[PDB]
Amino acid sequence: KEMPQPKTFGELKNLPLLNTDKPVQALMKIADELGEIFKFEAPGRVTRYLSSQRLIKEACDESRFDKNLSQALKFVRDFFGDGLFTSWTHEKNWKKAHNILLPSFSQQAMKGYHAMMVDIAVQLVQKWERLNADEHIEVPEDMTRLTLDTIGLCGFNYRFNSFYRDQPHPFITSMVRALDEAMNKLQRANPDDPAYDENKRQFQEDIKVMNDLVDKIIADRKASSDDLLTHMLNGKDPETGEPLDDENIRYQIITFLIAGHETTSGLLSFALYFLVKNPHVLQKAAEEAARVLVDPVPSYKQVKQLKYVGMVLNEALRLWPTAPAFSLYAKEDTVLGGEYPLEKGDELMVLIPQLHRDKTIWGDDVEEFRPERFENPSAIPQHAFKPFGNGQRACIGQQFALHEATLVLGMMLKHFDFEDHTNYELDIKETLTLKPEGFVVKAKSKKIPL
Ligand code: HEM
Ligand SMILES: COc1ccc2nc(SCc3ncc(C)c(OC)c3C)[nH]c2c1
């Protein structure tokens, strides 16, 4: 078969389709129109967007495809370097860092982050307890305060003190600007037009703000633990026998500060969004929180007891996976789905929100928010639900994000009643990652001591 392709713009081919503030949502609409696979061409570049579990299960075969750096990721390497997220699988620094840092996400490590997660979660509950009547909550803004602080504290013993700030923290402002610019770059026909001279200048200055903070974390540690930073500076890879060098460690820190919070903020924001729009689901989740979380602060074992809350989060990730795409390349010539020949090196994009809407897997009601879908996660076929990516290049922090989200959402649901007082219309902001923009609620305290 010859694969479908969306509308073209003469010599720019499909490039102008990306000239939009919401390019993943645009791609999703193209998928609904064209089906499980389409070609996307730009001047000098081609990739193939996959949306069906039928093809994606083959894309996920690590003997045939490896992680690719999409254009997006190539632009973000400018500050992420050969950190775990933007390193090729075959770069020496990938497996070394993987091996050195995986022990920071062991069960014992997770247990040892619990207390610090609680520290930040108590700060969020308190801010909300302390609002006056009729004040409201800027949801994704507060979720970012919580998630950035949580990775700062758990990972690096560093306090961003975001709940002591009325604006976003400076690190968040430059992060968002840098991600925005990477996203806007995707559509640029002539990236070296001098019209983009200012864009590049703002980009470097934002890279600088982020690296200045990295330098401080490193200085604090040299001046003061058993956390992610301890492993970065001290662990040896059992294979090579070598530790990470200084340059790579700096890339790891920036990588973990961003990947370690942005997408978790998004998940909590989408999860609160879907709860307030599904009052019976909210009540069922609130019932579990009350039942389970009997003590003044949650225990580790208690968070693991929050099954329905877990289900809520996975259902939020099904509809709006907050890192919505990952990319693969063909390790050798190969045929996808018995119908689409690929040559070695050809690129694929997995369009995760469309995968998550495959009616052959999920049934006809794919737009409904139904956490019950996840009542037995075993039931889900392989490669049908991939919000944390694939194989050895899957999310290292999956358990950390989920533990944090589950803890926080559990506390919110124990401690407050929520009101969607504006009848908020979902508006999804893209910064490569996804998050609701302008989402606000009011929270009425249930006056349960903390
Ligand atoms: C809901 C929250 C999260 C989502 C949806 C998410 C998603 C993802 C995805 C889709 C990938 C694979 C990317 C690719 O194939 O190009 C990935 C990788 C990664 N994630 Fe996460 N992530 C989340 C939370 C976190 C957290 C909390 C951390 C850190 C504690 C983190 C650290 C990383 C790292 C370092 C990688 C690269 C791993 C490797 O290739 O060795 N993630 N993530
Ligand atoms: C058209 O090209 C695109 C567009 C949007 C995209 N969004 C993505 S999601 C890429 C991504 N995944 C996971 C994490 C943890 C992460 O850290 C901030 C990022 C930037 N890739 C894209 C590629």
Side-chain angles (χ1 to χ4, degrees), residues 1-221 223 226-450:
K1 287 180 169 140
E2 256 312 357
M3 72 177 80
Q5 176 185 8
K7 58 196 181 193
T8 59
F9 290 75
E11 285 293 34
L12 300 175
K13 301 178 167 167
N14 299 303
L15 189 63
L17 295 181
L18 295 180
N19 190 5
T20 176
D21 302 327
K22 294 169 177 191
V24 175
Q25 292 163 88
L27 293 159
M28 275 168 78
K29 180 171 191 195
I30 288 169
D32 281 335
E33 261 165 60
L34 304 177
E36 65 177 354
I37 181 150
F38 64 90
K39 197 190 290 300
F40 187 95
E41 306 180 335
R45 268 208 302 291
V46 188
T47 193
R48 297 151 195 76
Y49 280 85
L50 308 189
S51 301
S52 61
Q53 186 269 359
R54 179 185 87 92
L55 296 179
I56 285 164
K57 74 192 168 149
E58 288 188 55
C60 295
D61 183 337
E62 289 172 297
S63 73
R64 307 160 67 190
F65 300 100
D66 182 25
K67 162 149 168 166
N68 186 55
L69 274 15
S70 59
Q71 294 295 309
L73 283 198
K74 289 186 175 160
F75 295 158
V76 161
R77 314 231 297 180
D78 283 347
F79 53 87
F80 275 150
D82 67 345
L84 276 182
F85 206 106
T86 49
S87 63
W88 299 90
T89 306
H90 53 65
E91 282 175 292
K92 171 171 171 174
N93 274 162
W94 180 74
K95 194 69 183 290
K96 265 179 81 163
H98 176 70
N99 286 340
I100 287 156
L101 298 183
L102 269 162
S104 283
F105 299 93
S106 73
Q107 286 285 125
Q108 183 195 291
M110 280 311 306
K111 288 170 195 182
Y113 302 140
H114 186 83
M116 278 167 313
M117 290 182 184
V118 163
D119 179 300
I120 311 316
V122 167
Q123 284 190 235
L124 166 83
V125 173
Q126 289 185 322
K127 176 182 180 155
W128 296 351
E129 291 285 18
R130 296 173 173 157
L131 302 173
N132 304 122
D134 303 331
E135 291 184 345
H136 71 273
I137 288 163
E138 303 181 317
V139 172
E141 286 83 4
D142 272 344
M143 303 300 97
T144 290
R145 290 185 168 85
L146 171 104
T147 62
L148 179 69
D149 284 22
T150 297
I151 193 66
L153 187 56
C154 297
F156 305 94
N157 204 201
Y158 187 72
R159 289 206 176 246
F160 292 97
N161 290 316
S162 299
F163 287 109
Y164 294 84
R165 297 155 193 276
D166 210 5
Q167 283 276 105
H169 191 287
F171 183 96
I172 298 298
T173 299
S174 296
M175 177 185 77
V176 178
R177 244 179 293 147
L179 289 176
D180 274 347
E181 162 69 8
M183 202 197 44
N184 187 260
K185 256 233 254 182
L186 290 174
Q187 59 136 308
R188 277 175 209 170
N190 301 96
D192 297 323
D193 191 310
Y196 305 119
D197 280 349
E198 174 51 21
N199 287 271
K200 292 165 201 216
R201 200 206 49 70
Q202 184 54 257
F203 196 52
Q204 288 301 298
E205 195 180 280
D206 287 325
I207 293 180
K208 178 69 165 69
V209 163
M210 285 195 305
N211 273 299
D212 285 345
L213 179 78
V214 173
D215 291 342
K216 284 188 187 192
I217 291 171
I218 297 264
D220 262 68
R221 181 56 54 112
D226 217 307
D227 53 22
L228 187 59
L229 188 48
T230 306
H231 292 259
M232 288 180 184
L233 293 166
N234 300 109
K236 312 302 195 217
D237 165 36
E239 296 184 33
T240 61
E242 305 179 10
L244 299 185
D245 59 34
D246 288 348
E247 190 163 31
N248 189 71
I249 285 164
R250 296 173 58 78
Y251 292 125
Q252 301 304 170
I253 297 171
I254 306 166
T255 297
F256 281 88
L257 292 183
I258 305 176
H261 95 269
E262 159 65 20
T263 49
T264 305
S265 176
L267 166 60
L268 280 164
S269 309
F270 281 117
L272 186 63
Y273 166 84
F274 278 119
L275 284 178
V276 300
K277 298 291 200 191
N278 296 85
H280 297 307
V281 181
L282 182 29
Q283 174 181 323
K284 184 169 168 176
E287 280 157 11
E288 178 179 84
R291 179 168 78 251
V292 169
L293 307 171
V294 296
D295 297 315
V297 295
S299 69
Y300 185 92
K301 293 293 140 221
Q302 274 163 0
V303 166
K304 299 283 174 195
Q305 289 173 33
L306 295 170
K307 187 196 168 99
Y308 199 72
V309 174
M311 287 159 62
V312 167
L313 287 159
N314 279 134
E315 181 69 348
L317 294 177
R318 185 184 68 81
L319 288 160
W320 291 112
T322 49
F326 60 96
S327 182
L328 301 158
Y329 74 89
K331 282 155 61 63
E332 299 293 344
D333 291 1
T334 190
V335 181
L336 206 69
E339 316 174 300
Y340 303 106
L342 299 185
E343 290 178 292
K344 174 175 189 192
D346 281 352
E347 292 170 65
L348 304 167
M349 294 295 308
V350 178
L351 182 63
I352 305 176
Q354 294 293 116
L355 166 69
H356 290 171
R357 283 161 176 81
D358 183 338
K359 298 168 181 313
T360 75
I361 291 295
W362 300 99
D364 280 350
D365 67 344
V366 294
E367 297 289 325
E368 294 284 326
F369 186 80
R370 271 209 297 117
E372 296 74 15
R373 290 175 202 279
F374 283 99
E375 191 90 61
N376 193 355
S378 297
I380 302 151
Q382 223 191 342
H383 302 137
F385 179 63
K386 314 282 279 172
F388 294 105
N390 182 62
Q392 66 182 344
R393 301 303 306 273
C395 186
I396 204 174
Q398 173 177 156
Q399 290 217 359
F400 185 99
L402 291 170
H403 188 77
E404 177 179 3
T406 305
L407 157 83
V408 166
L409 184 47
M411 296 183 75
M412 290 159 53
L413 288 170
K414 171 186 183 183
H415 280 283
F416 306 95
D417 288 301
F418 289 98
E419 182 194 347
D420 171 22
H421 63 295
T422 67
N423 186 23
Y424 170 78
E425 193 193 323
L426 185 62
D427 180 355
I428 296 169
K429 180 178 164 70
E430 304 202 11
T431 52
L432 303 179
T433 58
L434 304 183
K435 197 171 327 97
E437 178 177 12
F439 176 37
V440 288
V441 293
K442 287 178 174 182
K444 185 92 179 326
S445 176
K446 315 227 283 187
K447 297 292 167 24
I448 309 159
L450 191 53

